[PDB]
Amino acid sequence: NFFVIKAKENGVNVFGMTRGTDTRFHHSEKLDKGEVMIAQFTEHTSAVKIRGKAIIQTSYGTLDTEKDNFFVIKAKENGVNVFGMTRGTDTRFHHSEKLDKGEVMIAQFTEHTSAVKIRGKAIIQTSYGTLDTE
Template sequence: MDQRNGISQDFFVIKAKENGVHVIGLTRGMDTRFHHTEKLDKGEVMLAQFTEHTSAIKVRGKALILTRHGAIDTDE
């Protein structure tokens, strides 16, 4: 994993398989909070990465998530 300033340079892809897929970014630090939300419609693709502010991503809905570790299908 390539890192600069403590930020992962690895990207991951989220492809919506239905309308209304929510992608929610969660903060780092003592208190974990929602800090960003995106709504994807069927066929839309989002490229994302973890940052100094984002420690986790929550995906709600049917989607395909592609990472360097493999593919995750939320239908399964």
């Protein structure tokens, strides 16, 4: 699995996330207008966070952040939260990522994640189709 990022403006930032028990931020790369980034989901990276006006293009389709197994989340309005639920005998929220308007999160189901919870006004995409919370 892999995705594409194109920047419609300067300052677009792409964050990496660590795979495993610990969910922390992997140092980021900056994209200027016209620059393109193509990346895969690897052993060390299982999720990413995209901030700024950008074109995100994946196997499911194309997304425009400026306009109003793995899955995609887009924030229609500040206050969106994504919870990761632990795989195994116990179910608990081991990570809570906050998404601001225009931010996009791409994540996979991992050894430590088998379920997630999304809150607030957001756009969600999946292999089967797209879903709107509002």
